[PDB]
Ligand binder design. Structure first.
Ligand code: SF4
Length: 178
């Protein structure tokens, strides 16, 4: 069994075309503000109910966000795709791999591997670094191949699932406004 970090419902929809016995872990203190976190979480919940997925919801709180910001703040001023995002993704995946140890999963992964905007090599490198540090296997798949991303868009449109237009953190919202 594999514990798969869930970033958002569109990425989840892409991912589940290619996985069948996973437990999903929605953990995203990078998402601000709270109203946006709640909207994305409710979209994930909608997908999970529709397909009977097993999703666990991680902590979201002042303390959790402060830990995340502490981990990414020395690089605030680099764009997206830089070392800021490397630290961000490593924070999320480290918490996922810890949770996988705690729940008896021998493998972990992330729906960010389904995200058209993210750097697949950077994520593989992070997952394998964490695999080394915690001895939980990182399951890599290019979840976007097979045109699976389009399958995710189609199901999103049908199920009426919210599709966000910024990565999640305050930095990415500011870059959205440019
Ligand atoms: S842009 Fe996305 S990956 Fe980069 S720091 Fe913000 S939330 Fe994390």
């Amino acid at each position: 069994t594999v514990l798969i970090h869930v970033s958002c419902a569109p990425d989840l929809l892409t991912t589940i075309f290619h996985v069948r016995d996973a437990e999903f872990f929605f953990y995203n203190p990078n998402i601000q503000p709270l109203s946006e976190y709640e909207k994305r979480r409710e979209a994930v919940d909608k997908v999970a109910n529709h397909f009977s997925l097993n999703v666990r919801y991680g902590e979201y709180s002042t303390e959790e966000i402060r830990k995340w910001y502490t981990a990414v703040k020395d690089y605030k001023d680099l764009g997206e795709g830089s070392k800021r995002c490397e630290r961000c993704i490593s924070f999320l995946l480290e918490r996922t791999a810890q949770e996988a140890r705690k729940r008896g999963h021998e493998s972990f992964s992330t729906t960010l591997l389904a995200s058209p905007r993210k750097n697949l090599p950077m994520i593989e490198n992070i997952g394998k670094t964490i695999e080394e540090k915690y001895g939980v296997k990182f399951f890599f798949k290019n979840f976007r191949k097979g045109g699976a991303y389009q399958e995710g868009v189609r199901l999103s449109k049908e199920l009426g699932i919210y599709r966000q237009n910024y990565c999640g953190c305050v930095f990415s919202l500011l870059e959205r406004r440019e």
